[PDB]
Design a protein around this ligand. Structure first.
Ligand SMILES: [O][B](=O)C1=[C]C(Cl)=[C]C(Cl)=[C]1
Ligand SMILES: [O][B](=O)C1=[C]C(Cl)=[C]C(Cl)=[C]1
Ligand SMILES: [O][B](=O)C1=[C]C(Cl)=[C]C(Cl)=[C]1
Ligand SMILES: [O][B](=O)C1=[C]C(Cl)=[C]C(Cl)=[C]1
Ligand SMILES: [O][B](=O)C1=[C]C(Cl)=[C]C(Cl)=[C]1
Ligand SMILES: [O][B](=O)C1=[C]C(Cl)=[C]C(Cl)=[C]1
Lengths: 308, 298, 307
């Protein structure tokens, strides 16, 4: 069998994404019904930069599949330093049944996935957050039913990992995705072109705009995320003034469809990209969205393991 | 309906007796109760690390069928990157209980007011209630019934063990004495709090600088680390002289680690009255009992 | 009697054979032995962290049904806030074995003299006995019987791998050669213990500075990094003396034609070993890394059986 990896959202075809999302719903209802890692078989969960939320979700999810997550945190000689990345993929492929990796540049994920003989999953990277978007789509489906034809709008930094993954994973689900972002903060051209091509296969569409009010009008789902990652705090930019018109506040939510829901990859900086009234009001799905990381990541693992 | 255990008086006398009975059953049959089979998760969070607390909870949760997700001080500082309540609301979807080691109580109190799973104080700057459950289990297995026993704590009466021996001790019906120098006395709000549960159980609270008098007739002698800034405690050192004043077959307890030669001597630590090794082991069983009991009511 | 494994010769030749046989059985059936079902705990303690050691022990203990409680170097170092004796006594009530990565051998000895559960040396300054069990497992699967084999180690003759290959190798009946430059020779006490144990097994011990002679006729070539982290500030040029001892293609071609190459990872490609040797058909470094898992499980199973 070809070893399948999940490094970016378009790694799943539209039909394959639907299978994973269906499995996520079944695992949410019966969370110990699938035990492909019974033994326990090991899964490596590797952090180039620590992420407590990602670790909790994967550590527990892997255990509920029967397995044992072996967590390697950032303070451990760093992948690439004491050994080549390819030496590491070679030995890890003897110990564990899958490799879950939080890292920085996409080229590192690609390099690992080209030599590892077990599935590699991008837990979170600078360019994509594919597992969060699987959880997002699971949450939207719980609240709204069929994903096909929904209109989703993302606000804020249009070139961070969530904007890119909502583009790719959203159009893979048949969702019309709009990114509202100020000039200079637009999606990467390669990602935008991949999303446009993928949207052709599903009947979806990609829109990029600097008009937040237009992006909010008629939306079924409004999404935002922090305006600045930890790496960007030293980039020299004023990263507040450009984004203030894109704040997801009560006024912006009122422009959307009356049944609209709100998503946000946690943590939120309340008062910046989103307000308290929105975060804790009735349209917020952020808490279900956080919980669903567990189920969507378990489903992705079950799916990749049985294909590999 | 969502019960927390942040202080020893969070349990009534009848409820404490329930937990201690369950700790004895779990010591005998350590894998017979599996309320976390799955595994279901339990968060174990440290604002400051405690290897002893982590070791005991990690193994115990696993023996209850679950999986402890340990978050160290570096990742915690609860409030690090999101509000406390934002953290409590998500944790309540992932885990079935939250075990937390933090400094002040006000931090503990907030978490418990919002979380929708039980919150447990693993160790605080003011209370160490799980250790006292392990102490009461250790006393019961060596002395029988707790009610009517005389326990004396020696040394720093202003630290977490002194506060928890007062509250947990009187809750079990034990006459508790604290022997401490004037500068290092119990917190007044804990003292009156202990003084009030003692009325319900027939126990009592005494605070003296008289170590000789606190040791005389004692059935259980307890001390703890003091930390020359360490001058006022050495008349309270639990040595062979003080112990010789106690009741026959008295036992000695000490939340570990012990600094041998300071608050306690080798002769007492390694002698026949010492129960400190069983006491340390019983954190495992008493904490499992506390978890089992909190989980089946919450 | 409570058995410990602090150095390679803590197992007799017959006992080592039992552990190696178990390791082969566990590699075929990794979850069929559950002596730690419960889970019962095993303490895995690091005075200095070793990701490879923690990784392999953590997974291996889980596959025995147990739960590894890992105590890293961040946690207050053992012996600081209480006596090793005090810690040993309490650990003996919490876990069924103690796995410890520490520095001096006297610390391991002190722990094993007091603990009432088996103590394992996961890795120390003087010995790496678990890695050499994995090495012997690897040689057996690629060569057959171990008795009569000729193994040569190259590089720093006084590091933990050289000492354990000496002791564990002769216990298995292997003729062990250490090729090392002057001033980097095996500890005299370790060499004499190996020579004594060799008299029971028909093995032999050789120490030489002639790398070419050490490689001629060798069935197994082994090397290791030239410098541990605690040696980076020792003041020595730790490259120039070892250059003639590099495991390279020329050196390997002097050995027997089906010789295999071992190396405790990490390897510094270009220094003690070349890319062509690490990646060629004689290299067994990848199976050797994997066998840490199986050999350490076997050792735990065997120690728990007898304690
Ligand atoms: O980001 B944090 O403040 C945090 C804290 C805990 Cl205790 C658990 C998790 Cl998943 C995250
Ligand atoms: O503070 B310590 O010396 C310590 C050491 C270990 Cl290995 C385990 C525990 Cl619980 C405490
Ligand atoms: O923000 B949170 O406290 C949180 C916690 C977990 Cl365990 C998982 C996620 Cl996705 C978020
Ligand atoms: O030394 B390291 O590069 C390393 C990395 C991982 Cl991901 C796992 C292990 Cl065991 C070691
Ligand atoms: O002082 B000790 O070494 C110790 C160790 C454990 Cl695992 C638990 C407790 Cl309560 C004390
Ligand atoms: O070098 B390696 O990446 C490696 C990884 C593991 Cl898990 C174990 C060993 Cl022995 C070596």
């Amino acid at each position: 069998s070809v070893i399948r990896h999940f490094l970016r959202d378009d790694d799943l075809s539209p039909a394959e994404q639907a299978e994973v999302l269906e499995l996520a719903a079944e695992l949410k209802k019966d969370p110990v019904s699938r035990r492909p890692l019974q033994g326990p078989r090991g899964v490596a969960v590797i952090f180039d930069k620590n992420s407590t939320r990602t670790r909790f979700s994967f550590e527990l999810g892997i255990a509920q599949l029967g397995g044992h997550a072996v967590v390697v945190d950032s303070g451990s000689t760093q992948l690439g330093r004491d050994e080549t990345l390819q030496d590491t993929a070679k030995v890890l492929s003897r110990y564990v049944d899958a490799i879950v990796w939080r890292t920085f540049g996409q080229e590192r994920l690609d390099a690992m996935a080209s030599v590892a003989t077990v599935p590699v999953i991008n837990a979170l990277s600078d360019e994509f957050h594919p597992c969060q978007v699987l959880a997002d789509l699971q949450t939207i489906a719980e609240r709204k039913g069929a994903l096909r034809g929904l209109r989703l709008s993302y606000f804020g930094d249009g070139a961070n990992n969530m904007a890119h993954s909502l583009l790719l994973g959203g159009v893979t689900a048949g969702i019309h995705v709009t990114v509202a972002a100020p000039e200079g903060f637009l999606p990467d051209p390669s990602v935008r072109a991949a999303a446009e091509r993928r949207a052709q296969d599903t009947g979806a569409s990609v829109t990029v705009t600097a008009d937040a009010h237009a992006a909010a009008a008629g939306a079924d789902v409004l999404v935002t995320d922090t305006w600045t990652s930890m790496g960007q705090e030293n980039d020299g930019l004023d990263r507040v003034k450009p984004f203030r018109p894109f704040q997801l506040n009560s006024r912006l939510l009122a422009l959307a469809d009356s049944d609209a829901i709100v998503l946000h990859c946690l943590p939120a900086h309340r008062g910046d990209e989103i307000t308290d009234a929105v975060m804790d009001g009735p349209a917020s799905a952020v808490w279900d969205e956080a919980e669903n990381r567990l189920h969507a990541q378990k489903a992705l693992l079950v799916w990749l393991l049985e294909r590999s």
